[PDB]
Amino acid sequence: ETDCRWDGCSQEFDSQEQLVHHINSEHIHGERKEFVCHWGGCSRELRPFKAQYMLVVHMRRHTGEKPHKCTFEGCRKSYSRLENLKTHLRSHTGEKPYMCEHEGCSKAFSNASDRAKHQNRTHSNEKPYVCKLPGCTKRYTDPSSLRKHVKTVHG
DNA sequence: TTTCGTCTTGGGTGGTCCACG
């Protein structure tokens, strides 16, 4: 939010455009000696990336930049991951390209991942969002059901 | 080369919604 925080760099700024410009040119762009974020609190410190285009997407965490805009006139939602914008898209249509494929369900998602939750969870059997308050033994399929409990109940 | 493509896997929030205790 308007100011590099790359280790040592001190450019404050005016527009996302510029900052998210400076990074790719200043820090991520050039060099032939390995790409790693060096941003303040980076949850990976220096867990280098494989390719360097991968770092580049990562910053969008740090930067805030969701550059894949939606097209459907009127709507103005970006994302910062292509995959995402793709799905955000279908919703404008109803496109559920992604059927629960396996064992014999026939239900489908606008996207792959939600198809994989449902997919594993809804045909679960186990419930691994077990609450961890002693004298409960309360477990659910999804973090949401859990979460609601450990706080409607405990907490 | 590197980057994409698209999938897999995985860490979240807000909620409907209704059935059964």
Next chain:
DNA sequence: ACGTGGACCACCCAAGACGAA
């Protein structure tokens, strides 16, 4: 006679891998 608990979903989004452009 019935309230809520919790299964299931919608959106959120990071990142591997591995091959294709």
